[PDB]
Amino acid sequence: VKDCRNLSDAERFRREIVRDASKKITAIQNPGLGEFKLRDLNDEVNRLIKLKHAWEQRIRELGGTDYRKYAQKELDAIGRETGNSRGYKYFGAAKDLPGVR
Amino acid sequence: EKGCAFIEFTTREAAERAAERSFNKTFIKGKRLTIRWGTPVPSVPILPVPDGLAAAPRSLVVPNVRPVKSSSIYYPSQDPTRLGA
Amino acid sequence: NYTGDGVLALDKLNLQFLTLHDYLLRNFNLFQLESTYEIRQDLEDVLFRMKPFQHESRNETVFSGWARMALQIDHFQISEVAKPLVGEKSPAVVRGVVTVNIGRRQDIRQEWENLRKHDVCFLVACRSRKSASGLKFDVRRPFSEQIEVLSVRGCDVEGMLDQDGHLLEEFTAWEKKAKIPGDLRKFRLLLDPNQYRIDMEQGTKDDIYDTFNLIVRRDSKTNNFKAVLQTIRDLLNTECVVPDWLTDVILGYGEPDSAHYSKLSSAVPELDFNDTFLSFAHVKESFPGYKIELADGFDEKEAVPPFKLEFKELERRQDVEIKPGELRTILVTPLTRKKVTPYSYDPRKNQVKFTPSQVEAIKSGMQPGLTMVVGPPGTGKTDVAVQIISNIYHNWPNQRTLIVTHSNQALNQLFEKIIALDVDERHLLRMGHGEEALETEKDFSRYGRVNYVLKERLQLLNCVEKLAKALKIVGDVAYTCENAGYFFRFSVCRVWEEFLAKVTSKGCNKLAEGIISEIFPFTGFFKDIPDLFSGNNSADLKVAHSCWRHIEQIFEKLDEFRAFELLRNGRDRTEYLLVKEAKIIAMTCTHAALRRNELVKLGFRYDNIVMEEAAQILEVETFIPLLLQNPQDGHNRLKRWIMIGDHHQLPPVVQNQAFQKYSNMEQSLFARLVRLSVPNVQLDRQGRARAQIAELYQWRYNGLGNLPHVDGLPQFQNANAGFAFPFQFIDIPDFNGHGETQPSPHFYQNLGEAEYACALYTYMRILGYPAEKISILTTYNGQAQLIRDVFQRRCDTNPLIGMPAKVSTVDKYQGQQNDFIILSLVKTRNIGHIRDVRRLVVALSRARLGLYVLGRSKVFMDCLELTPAMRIFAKYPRKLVILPFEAHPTIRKWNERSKDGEPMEIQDTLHMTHFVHEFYMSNLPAMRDAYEQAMNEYMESQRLL
Amino acid sequence: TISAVAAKFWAPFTAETHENFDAKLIDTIYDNEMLKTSFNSRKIMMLEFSQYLEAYLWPNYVPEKASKAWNMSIVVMINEKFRERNLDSWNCFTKKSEHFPHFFKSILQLSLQEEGLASSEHCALLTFLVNAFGSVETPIVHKETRKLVSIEIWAGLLDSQREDLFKKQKKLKKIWENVRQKMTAAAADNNEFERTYLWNLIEKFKRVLNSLEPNEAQESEEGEVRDPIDSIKYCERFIELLIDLESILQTRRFFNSVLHSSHILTHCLLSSLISTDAGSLFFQLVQLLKFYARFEIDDLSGRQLTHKEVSEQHYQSVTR
Amino acid sequence: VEYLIERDQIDEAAKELTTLVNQDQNVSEKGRTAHQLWTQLCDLISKNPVKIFSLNVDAIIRQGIYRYTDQVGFLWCSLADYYIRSAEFERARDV
C-alpha cells in the first residue's frame, strides 16, 4: 500500500523500489545461487515491478507524470512475459532453468 | 528609487509562510504591502581614464621626470583562498 | 615531491626497448599513472570549486559553489547489464542513465549538451569532512583533510536522451535544433564492465552506484586517456604488425638510417617536383653540389616549371654510379602539362622560393620511409609540410594522407595554407571536437564537406542540363548522377567519338581547313567563352581535347558523388566521405586516439602520415596514429611517415615530477629518434624576425641563419620606435622591498616585474604601438595570473590603453609569435626552470621585432646554459633606455643613435611607473583626440552598410 | 662559502683575476662541503650551478694527480647534472675526452674498493653507473660501458652454462674459441678487469645486502656503526642497474646469463631486507627485476616470443 | 553458417555462430535457441581443434562449465576431448 500520500515522496519511493530492484537483479544473474533462492528473488523482482507500477498510479492520481507512457521497453528487454503468465517476467539465469526455458 | 524591496529567506518554508500570511494583508507601516515571488598598489599611480570613452599622435611631448634620489594582497591571484576557487 | 635523488619502482622511457610488447607495456603503465594524476588534479580543483558542505540538519552533501566542469546528479540509475559475450567474463554493456539540471548560463549549457560518444566523465560521490554554513578551502592544505571522496567511477558518455528517451546520435545535433524543454537533461552512460564485475564479485546489498551526487567532465585535450589505454591493451592482445622497415627504429636497433630512403630499396629516383620550384634558376640554386642539366630537346630559354628530377645516385643498378670525373648529376625535364580546361583558369600554385634545406626536406618527404625534419623558429616548417602534401597528392593521387598535429591552431594554419595550393576542396577533411567552430571560411568538418558535396552535385547537374540542351537531347538526364552517367556514356561520348572519327579519318588530309570549328559538337555548352576555335585544325584539335577534358571532369565528379544519392543518411555519408572521398585527412593526436576504434571498424585506410609539432606530442600519442588501420597482409600498408618538430623547443607537458623526470615521459618520440641519431633535416634559414633578435636563440641550432629579406625589409631595418635598442634585458630591482613572492607551492610571482610590464606596455601604447602587436609573456604560470590581474585592473579599464594581444606563459605561447614581446623572468633568489635551454629558446624566439626581458640579471648572467644568450644581452644596457620623442613608426635605423633630443634611462619599477604616469598624462589630450577621431571614422564608415 | 671560493678560483665573471689552480682545494671542498655535510643538496647544487666541474675539476684533470676526492667530486657534479635532467651532462668530457677513460676506470675501481669510502660515496658511484649505462647515445661513454658487458663476461659462467648457450646458437662457439685464444694473452691485463667487473660488483652487492641481516648488522667491536639507510639505497640503486642492464637488448644479450648464473634474485628474495618495512621499495624493484629477468624474448636473436610459444616451451621443459 | 561449414570455412563459421549466440532472441528463424546455437558452437569448436584459430576454445568451453551447471560433467569431458583430438595429451591430463 502507499506509505506516503505526498507526490514528491511517491516519486522517491518509486525510485527507491527501482533502486532496490536493480540490486536484486544483479543477484539473480550470478550462477552460484540456488534454484529456490533464484526463484524467490525472481518473485521479489516481479513484485517490486508491480509495486513500481502501483506507485506510478499513486503519482498519476496525485497529478504527477504518467510514467506508463514514458515506460521505456528496457525493462521488457530482460524480462519476457510467458503467454500463459500474463504479467510475470523471468530475468537473468531464470531463463536457464529446466521447464522455464 | 522604485518603492520596492527584496528579501531572501534561509528556507522556502519561511518564504512561503511569510508570503501566504502577508500577501493582501493590511499592515500598519505599508498600509497594504503588495508581495510577489522572484587596494591600490603602493607607489604605483593609477592612470585616470577620460570621461565618456566607455590611434595615437605621431608627435609626442616628454615629461621632465627624474628618479627618486610587508606587502599584502592587492590582486586576487596573490591570495591562496581565491586561487583555490 | 620527487627531486631526482631517489630510485622509484617505475618503468623508464630510455632510448631502446626490447620488443614491441615491452615498448607498449611501459607506455601503458606510465600513461595510466600520469592520466590518473591528471584526473586527481582535475577532481580536487573541481571539488574545491563546487565547495561541498554538510547540511546543518541533514546527512546529505550540499554544494554551495559552481564549476564549469561539474553538475549535481539529480538522479542516477543502471538501465542494462548485458550478458557476457561468448568467451568473456565481464558484462557486454552496463548502461547508466544520469539526470542533471544544466542551469541557465548559456555557454556552459552548450558545453554539457555537446557531450559526445566516447567522451569520458566521472560519477563522483563526495562529502565534506568539515561542517560549516558554507566553507572555504585552502590549496595550502591537503584535499583529503577537507573533502572526502568515497566513490569515483568513470563512464563513457553516450549521447543525450530526448523527451521520450531516444538517443541523439552525433549527426542529429547538426539538424535536430528543436531544443529539449526545460533545464533538465538525461545522458546515457557506459560504465566499465570490469569494474562492475569487480564491484559485484564482493557481493552487494549496499550499492556503490546509488551513492553518486556529482558528474564531472574532462576538457577537450584529456578525454583521450581511456581511448589511449584501450588502444594499447588491444595492441598488446593482438598480433600488432608495425612495418618491417619501421619496427627497428621505433625500438632503436639496427642502423638508425634503415628507415631512411637512402637505405631503403623502395626509394624512387624520378620525382615530379610539381611546383616546388618557381624557375629553372631555382632548381640550380636548390641543389648545391650537384650537376644540373636539361634533357635533350629542352633549352634554358624555355625550361619552365613543372620539373621532373631524376637523381641518378638513387638507381641501384651497378652501371649507374658516382663515377670519377663528374659531380652528382640531377637530370631535369620540364613537363608540358596539357591543360584540362578551355576556360581562363589561373592555377593555384606554390609561391615559396624554398631554400636548399627546405628542398632537401621536400625531396625526402616524397621518398618512402621515415622523414624527420627539425624546424627552428621561423624556418617555414609549415610550408615544407604543405608542399609534401601537395606533391604527394599530385604524384600519387590514389594515396591517402592522414595529418596528425598537436594543436588545433597549427591544424588551422595547415589548412589555410593547403587551400592556396592546387588541392581540390572536396578531397580535404578535418576532424575534431572543434568542428562546430572552425575558423576557416571554408568548413572542412565531416558535416561541412557533406554539404559541399551536396551543393556541388546540384551545380554540376545544372551543367548536365546545359550540356543536354546544347546537344538538343530531351529527357530527364539532369535528374540524378545516375541519369547523367548514362547520358554521358551513351550520348556525350558517342557524339565525341563521332567527332574524333571525322578529324582522324578525313580531317588530317581531305577536309577543309578550320572545319573543326564547324563539326565540334559542344559549341553550345561553352557559349560563355568567345572565340573558342581560331580556325586551324592542327591547333583547334588541341583545345577541342581541352574542351572535352572539361566535360569529362564534370561526369568524373558526378560518378564519385553517386554514393551521396544511395547513402541518404548523415552517418553513412560521412563514412563514405571519410573512407573513400577524402585524400587528405587532418586530425589532432588527441582525436586520433579517440577515433581509432571507429576508424579501424570503418576500414579507414591511409598511406602517409604527416606529423607536425611532433616534438610536442607524447611518445604514446605519437605511436597510435601509425595503427589507425588494419594490416591487410603480413605487413602494414603505410608508405611514408613525416615528422616535423623541434627537439630544442619545449617537450610535451608532463605534470607529475617523477613521471616527467624519472620515467622520462617528457621525451617525445621525435626527441627520442633524434637521440638515436636518426637522419633529420635542419631547416637552416629563418625568415620571421630580426637577425638581432634571431641571434639570441640561433646559437642553439647548427647553421641556422637568416633569409635574404631579413636584412632588406624596412620593418627589420628600422628601429623600434621609442626604444634605443631593439632588445634589452632589464635588471628589475626589488619593488616594495620584495623580489619574487610565492603564495602557493611552486606558484611563483614577482609584482615588481608585473607592474613594470604594465607600465612598459602602456609606454608602447602611448607611442602608438598597436595592442595587437604586443604580447606579454612570463616563464611561470603564477606570474601570468598576476600580470593578467594587473592588466585587468590598470589597462583593460582604460579604452585608450586597451589590452595586450595575449598574456601567456611561454609554454602556452610555443608555436606562436608576435612583433613585440615583454618577457618577465620571475625569479630573483635562484634560477628557475628557465635553465632548461628548451624553455629559453622558446622564450627568446617569440619576438619578431622587439624583445624586452624583465628579470634579475644576477640570477641569470652567471648560468652556464644561458651564457650564450646572456653575452648578447650584455652588449646592451641593463636599464631600459627609451626615446620618448619617437612615436610609432620611426624612420630611424635600428643601429643608429637618434638625432632628435636625447634618451632617458629608466632606473626601476618606481621610476618607470612614475614616468609612464606623467608621459600618459602629458600626452592625454592628443592621445584622446586621436581615439575620438578613430572611433568616429569607424562608426561613420560602417553607417552606410 | 662556495660563492666566495668560486668567485676567487673559477667563476667565469672573474676569469680575468681568479687564482691559479690548486688541486688541494678540491680535496678541501670535497671533504668540507660535500662529504662532511653528507652531500648536502644545497651545497652541491650551488657548486654545480657555479660551473665547478666545467671550469675547475675537468680542465685541470691530469690522471697522475687525480685523488679519490677529485674523482668522486666529478662524479658528484655529474650526478647533479643528471638529476636536473635537462642538461648535456657529458659535455665537458666530450670536449676534453683524453682523460675520460682513465677517469671512468678509476671510478670503477672505487666501486669495487671497499675500504676507505663511505656508503654515501658508494651510492654516488653506483648512481654514476646507472647514469653511464643510461646514456647509451654519448659515444665517449658508450665505448666504456660496452667493454663491461661483452661476451667475455661469460668467462664467469659455469662450463655447463656456456655449453647450453652454444647449443642455443651454434655460431657462438666458434666466436668463443676466437675470444678464448685472444683473451688468454692479448690485452688480458686490461681485459681481465673488464670481464670480471660485473662479477665483482655483484659480489659487493651481496656483501652490502648481507650487512643488513639482523645477525650481521650488530655494532662492531671497534665501535663504528653503519646506518642502514645508505646501504638500502645502495641495494635499491643496484637493482635499478640490473633492470637497466636487462631492459636493453645489447646488454641483456650477455648479462641475462650472468644475472641467472649469479643467482642474484635468490640472494635478493631470501634476504632479510625484502621482509622489512624499510626494504619495501627494494621489494618493488626486485619484483620489477624478476619480470625482466625472464621476459618473453630470445636474447641471442632478439625475437619476441608469443604467449603460445612461451607456454608450449614451458610444458615441453617440465615434461623433459 | 551452413554454407561456410559445407565449404570447410570452419573458423569463419564459428565466428558467425558467436555472432548468432550474442543475440538474445529466444529462438532463431531455424528454430534454434541460444543454448542450442551455443551447443553447435561447442560441438564445432571441440571436434575441429586443428582447423580453428580465432577462438580461445578452452576459454569458451570453461565459460560453459560456468553457468551450465546441469552439464558440467559433460563439458569437462568435452574440453578434454578437444585436447585429445589435438593430441595434446599432457593438457588433456591437466583437464
Side-chain angles (χ1 to χ4, degrees), chain C residues 790-846:
Chain C
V790 170
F791 277 66
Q792 282 166 26
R793 182 168 295 167
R794 201 161 170 268
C795 290
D796 192 21
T797 56
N798 190 331
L800 304 180
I801 302 308
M803 193 71 178
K806 191 165 174 177
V807 179
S808 183
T809 61
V810 170
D811 304 25
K812 296 294 96 179
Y813 216 76
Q814 170 54 3
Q816 305 201 250
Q817 57 258 317
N818 213 333
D819 286 354
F820 307 101
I821 301 297
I822 294 161
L823 172 66
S824 160
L825 301 190
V826 194
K827 303 299 302 298
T828 62
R829 301 302 186 100
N830 65 337
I831 197 167
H833 60 58
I834 190 57
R835 194 174 181 208
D836 188 349
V837 179
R838 303 172 297 182
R839 287 271 163 43
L840 184 73
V841 167
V842 175
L844 299 183
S845 62
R846 300 307 92 196

Side-chain angles (χ1 to χ4, degrees), chain C residues 17 199 304 307 474 746 765 808 824 849:
Chain C
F17 301 85
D199 289 341
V304 291
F307 301 105
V474 58
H746 303 289
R765 288 294 299 138
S808 183
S824 160
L849 301 187

Side-chain angles (χ1 to χ4, degrees), chain D residues 273-317:
Chain D
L273 183 59
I274 290 291
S275 303
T276 69
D277 297 343
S280 52
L281 193 141
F282 176 80
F283 167 83
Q284 294 173 6
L285 287 169
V286 170
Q287 297 305 321
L288 183 57
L289 180 60
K290 205 184 80 188
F291 174 58
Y292 288 106
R294 201 158 60 133
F295 192 83
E296 299 90 352
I297 188 177
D298 177 27
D299 330 298
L300 305 180
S301 69
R303 189 175 64 85
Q304 181 176 266
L305 308 182
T306 68
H307 65 299
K308 181 178 183 287
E309 177 167 22
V310 173
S311 185
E312 184 174 330
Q313 287 198 132
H314 174 76
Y315 266 72
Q316 182 72 349
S317 180

Side-chain angles (χ1 to χ4, degrees), chain B residues 44-59:
Chain B
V44 178
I46 295 175
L47 306 177
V49 187
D51 59 335
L53 298 183
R58 263 60 188 193
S59 181

Side-chain angles (χ1 to χ4, degrees), chain C residues 422-438:
Chain C
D422 199 16
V423 175
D424 198 4
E425 210 199 291
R426 64 197 178 103
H427 290 162
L428 291 160
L429 175 58
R430 193 191 187 293
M431 298 182 61
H433 290 65
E435 65 187 352
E436 294 87 352
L438 299 184

Side-chain angles (χ1 to χ4, degrees), chain B residues 39-63 65-71 74-81 83-85, chain C residues 48 136 138-139 735 738 743-744 747 749 751 755 762 767-768 785-786 789-790 793-794 799-800 884 887-888 907 910-911 913-914 917-924 926 928 930-931:
Chain B
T39 69
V41 182
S43 195
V44 178
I46 295 175
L47 306 177
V49 187
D51 59 335
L53 298 183
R58 263 60 188 193
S59 181
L60 295 169
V61 56
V62 64
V65 182
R66 200 282 314 284
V68 175
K69 290 295 183 179
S70 73
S71 187
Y74 315 114
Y75 295 104
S77 58
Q78 300 179 302
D79 182 355
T81 72
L83 181 60
Chain C
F48 289 145
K136 60 168 285 284
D138 303 279
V139 297
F735 188 57
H738 296 275
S744 297
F747 194 90
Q749 295 176 325
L751 179 64
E755 292 294 346
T762 302
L767 296 175
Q785 309 308 325
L786 179 58
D789 298 347
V790 170
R793 182 168 295 167
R794 201 161 170 268
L800 304 180
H888 183 66
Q907 295 295 120
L910 199 161
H911 181 77
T913 55
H914 286 208
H917 169 68
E918 293 289 345
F919 188 59
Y920 174 86
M921 185 55 59
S922 192
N923 296 280
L924 188 57
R928 187 192 174 145
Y931 179 72

Side-chain angles (χ1 to χ4, degrees), chain B residues 2-83:
Chain B
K2 293 187 170 68
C4 300
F6 309 87
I7 296 185
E8 185 179 319
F9 290 92
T10 55
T11 63
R12 171 174 262 258
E13 295 93 325
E16 285 181 7
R17 291 190 294 95
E20 87 184 352
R21 307 184 190 206
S22 70
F23 173 83
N24 201 20
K25 299 291 292 184
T26 51
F27 180 55
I28 295 166
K29 306 296 185 160
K31 311 174 191 176
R32 201 170 192 139
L33 298 178
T34 66
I35 296 176
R36 217 74 198 173
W37 279 95
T39 69
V41 182
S43 195
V44 178
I46 295 175
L47 306 177
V49 187
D51 59 335
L53 298 183
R58 263 60 188 193
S59 181
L60 295 169
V61 56
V62 64
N64 195 16
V65 182
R66 200 282 314 284
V68 175
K69 290 295 183 179
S70 73
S71 187
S72 63
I73 305 298
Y74 315 114
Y75 295 104
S77 58
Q78 300 179 302
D79 182 355
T81 72
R82 279 178 280 180
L83 181 60

Side-chain angles (χ1 to χ4, degrees), chain C residues 169-369:
Chain C
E169 68 176 33
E170 305 189 71
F171 303 101
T172 62
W174 306 105
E175 60 99 340
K176 205 68 163 69
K177 298 303 195 184
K179 202 68 160 180
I180 303 299
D183 303 316
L184 294 171
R185 299 297 179 263
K186 297 183 182 178
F187 302 88
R188 181 182 277 165
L189 298 182
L190 310 183
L191 288 159
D192 188 343
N194 303 279
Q195 189 56 44
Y196 188 83
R197 198 187 64 67
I198 294 162
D199 289 341
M200 298 296 157
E201 73 173 35
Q202 57 158 4
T204 173
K205 293 296 172 293
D206 54 328
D207 190 354
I208 293 169
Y209 297 99
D210 294 349
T211 65
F212 308 133
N213 51 18
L214 295 181
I215 182 167
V216 185
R217 47 177 280 247
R218 303 211 78 203
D219 73 9
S220 310
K221 64 184 68 175
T222 57
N223 261 262
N224 71 318
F225 77 96
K226 180 258 186 176
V228 169
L229 294 172
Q230 183 72 64
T231 295
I232 302 156
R233 176 187 280 187
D234 295 347
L235 295 169
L236 281 167
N237 279 273
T238 60
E239 297 296 337
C240 182
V241 189
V242 173
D244 190 27
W245 56 267
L246 187 55
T247 185
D248 288 343
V249 299
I250 287 181
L251 300 184
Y253 306 132
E255 308 302 330
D257 60 354
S258 58
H260 187 58
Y261 76 90
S262 182
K263 292 297 188 178
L264 294 180
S265 60
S266 58
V268 63
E270 181 183 355
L271 289 173
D272 186 4
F273 287 74
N274 178 76
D275 55 338
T276 308
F277 305 119
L278 303 181
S279 62
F280 186 62
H282 186 203
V283 183
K284 280 179 173 278
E285 289 178 357
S286 296
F287 301 90
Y290 290 80
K291 185 67 160 69
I292 280 164
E293 64 195 51
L294 296 170
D296 297 341
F298 303 111
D299 192 347
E300 294 96 324
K301 323 302 179 286
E302 288 92 37
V304 291
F307 301 105
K308 296 192 304 179
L309 273 63
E310 293 168 49
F311 301 95
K312 299 303 186 76
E313 296 74 25
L314 300 184
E315 300 191 31
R316 302 305 189 179
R317 55 177 172 161
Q318 183 60 25
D319 196 33
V320 184
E321 176 61 305
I322 311 173
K323 295 179 294 192
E326 188 56 283
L327 301 178
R328 288 67 54 168
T329 294
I330 302 171
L331 176 65
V332 180
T333 43
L335 296 186
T336 56
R337 295 287 187 77
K338 191 172 182 175
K339 69 173 186 283
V340 299
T341 182
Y343 287 94
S344 55
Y345 172 54
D346 183 18
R348 288 179 286 155
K349 298 291 288 192
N350 183 286
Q351 299 192 122
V352 179
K353 193 183 176 186
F354 294 115
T355 59
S357 56
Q358 295 178 80
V359 177
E360 180 171 21
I362 290 160
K363 177 189 175 187
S364 306
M366 287 187 283
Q367 297 288 358

